[PDB]
Amino acid sequence: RNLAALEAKISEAKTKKNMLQARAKAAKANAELQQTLGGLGTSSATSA
Amino acid sequence: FERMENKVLDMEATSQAAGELAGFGIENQFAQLEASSGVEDELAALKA
Amino acid sequence: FERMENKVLDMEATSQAAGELAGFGIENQFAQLEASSGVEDELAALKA
Amino acid sequence: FERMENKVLDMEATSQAAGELAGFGIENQFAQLEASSGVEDELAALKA
Amino acid sequence: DPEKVLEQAVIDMQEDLVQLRQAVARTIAEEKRTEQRLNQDTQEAKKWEDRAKLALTNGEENLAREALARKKSLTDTAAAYQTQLAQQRTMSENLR
Amino acid sequence: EDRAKLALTNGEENLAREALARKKSLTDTAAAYQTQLAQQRTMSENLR
């Protein structure tokens, strides 16, 4: 019974962390795309 | 999970910093874009 | 029998390669050949 | 099977990358191709 | 010279639009991969439901409830991947 | 056009519209060469 509970805890913890890491990486990638789409070189164009 | 949660809180703080900064003219430009879309719908009604 | 079956599968693959390639004008030429055959049948009906 | 599944996921990621990129004029060209096909059907109705 | 500065800004913008194309293509692959995951998890949920129907046909309600517990785990995991996918879809449209 | 008349005589409106699409391409190419020719005629008279 301890082994069955241990395997369940390991499996759930591993898969939950893996999908959380994947979604966190996707979320920060989208945030950097929106930030870089905002942060255009408008001051350099204005200086020209 | 606490290290990942600290990186999520850094993305929330980055989103708060962008949200207070990003007050721009572009909202009035989107109202002009919607007016231009209304002109294309009036041209579609004229074609119909 | 497996070596002969591999040569049969090479002829099937060759037939598939010919079948995808062989889209040609000649099908419209066969419709003209059938029209010309119809003219020879009309000349046979005239002779009769 | 996991190495093959990683190559399938690379083809899915390649298909997603093509799907976000491939917004093109060609869809309006296909509407012109369908209009030209409609002209050939009108010429077939005229012949009939 | 202002003409050289604005030409350099336009060159830098060619690098930026390539970086944003990469970020879109990555996000497109992440949404397609999490769709693929939830699609196969729901197909495994059907397999475990059919395993429960076989157990019920044999009268083994114990094995049927165990197989339905695999079905629950898989459909809950597919709902988690659908929730993750919703964040990928909105980010994909934001980058687009 | 005569290939289209043969296709219509056989009832193949699909082949008739395809043959008329070759007719369209050729007559449009002849109109492009007539436009090019108009520039050659005026240049020929200018040099004369």
Q: How far apart are CA A24 and CA E91, in angstroms?
A: 12
Closest residue, chain B, to A17 (C-alpha): B1
Maximal CA-CA distance, chain D: 60
Q: Identify which of E20, B23, E30 has the alpha carbon closest to the alpha carbon of residue A31.
A: E20
Q: Within 13 Å of residue B13, how many CA atoms lie on the same side as its CB?
A: 6
Q: Identify which of E37, E29, E34 has the alpha carbon closest to the alpha carbon of residue E74.
A: E37
- Give the mutation candidate from A28, A36, A37 for the B interface (greatest B CB count, under 10 A): A28
Cα E67 from chain centre: 25
F12 near C CB under 8 A: yes
Chains in touch with D (≥3 Cβ pairs < 8 A): E, F
Q: How was this structure obtained?
A: cryo-EM
Q: Do A44 and E91 touch (CB under 8 A)?
A: no
- Counting other chains too, the contacts that D17-22 makes at CB distance below 8 Å and 24 or more residues apart are D17/E24, D17/E25, D17/E26, D17/E28, D17/E29, D19/E28, D20/E24, D20/E25, D20/E27, D20/E28, D20/E92, D20/E96, D21/E21, D21/E24, D21/E25
Tokens of C2: 């497996």
Q: Do D47 and F20 touch (CB under 8 A)?
A: no
Q: Is D45 helix (H, G, I), strand (E, B) or coil?
A: helix
Q: Do E20 and A29 touch (CB under 8 A)?
A: no
Under 8 Å between Cβ of E62 and D38: no
Number of helices and strands in chain B (H, E): 2, 0
Q: Identify which of D33, D43, C21 has the alpha carbon closest to the alpha carbon of residue F7.
A: D43
CB-nearest to E25 from D9, D12, D20 is D20
Chain A positions in Cβ-Cβ contact with residue E81 (cut-off 8 Å) = 19
Amino acid residing at E7 = E
Query: What residues contact E82, with CB distance under 8 A and at least 6 apart?
Result: E38
Q: Is E4 helix (H, G, I), strand (E, B) or coil?
A: helix
Within 10 Å of residue C19's Cβ, how many Cβ atoms? Answer: 9
Distances (CA, A) of A2 to A6, A7, E67: 6, 9, 21
Query: What residues contact D44, with CB distance under 8 A and at least 6 apart?
Result: F8, F13, F16, F17
Closest residue, chain E, to D9 (C-alpha): E33
Amino acid residing at E95 = L
CA distance F21 to chain D (A): 8
First vs last C-alpha separation in chain C: 59
Resolution (A): 6.6
